[PDB]
Amino acid sequence: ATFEIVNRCSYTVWAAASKGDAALDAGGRQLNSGESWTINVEPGTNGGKIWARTDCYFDDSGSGICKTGDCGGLLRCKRFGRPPTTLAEFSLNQYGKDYIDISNIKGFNVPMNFSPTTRGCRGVRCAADIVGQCPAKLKAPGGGCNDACTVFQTSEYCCTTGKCGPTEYSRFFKRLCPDAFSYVLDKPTTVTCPGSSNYRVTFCPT
Ligand code: NA
Ligand code: NA
16 A cells, blocks of 8 residues: 655654554655655555654664654654654554544644545544644643643553543544544544555645
8 A cells, every 4th residue: 555645844754654563664754845755555554653753863874863753763663653643543454444543642743634545435634733722731842742641641541441531631632633533432533445545644734
């Protein structure tokens, strides 16, 4: 499956693609403002994610740091990134279908649209100014808007026991972006797409 990753932001982002225990494609690349990077994701990929990293520095060998989304200091991500990270999430070829969503469960750093480029389903988007509007206690000094689990580490925010409800904090994310997950047990906003669809992830879509 192809994922075209497009940076419409006015600032550089470092795109990242991982399934948690491995890179997807090269795992990460710099995208200047306007640039597009197309990756290939193996069919059957379960639990894949794409995200943006901001304010990154890497040496010649691909080692460095990012202020949001850092994945172990690597340009080419092998693992998931450090919150806050708006997440494009997907599982491909799962009994004949693909499944996509955007999640704010790990916070928000960069607005994103995640849409198919092939027929048969809709895209999803979280493009509101969540950083500018972020509650004081959730603001990350490094940049971005943390989720409450990251800040406060309680069973209720982290849904540790699989029993949790919405919270003041999850409702903020849900209000700004109704079409993304705001906490672990949120009413799903997952889209079912035809098996082997292709996609475009656009940072700063509006
Ligand atoms: Na998923
Ligand atoms: Na999810």
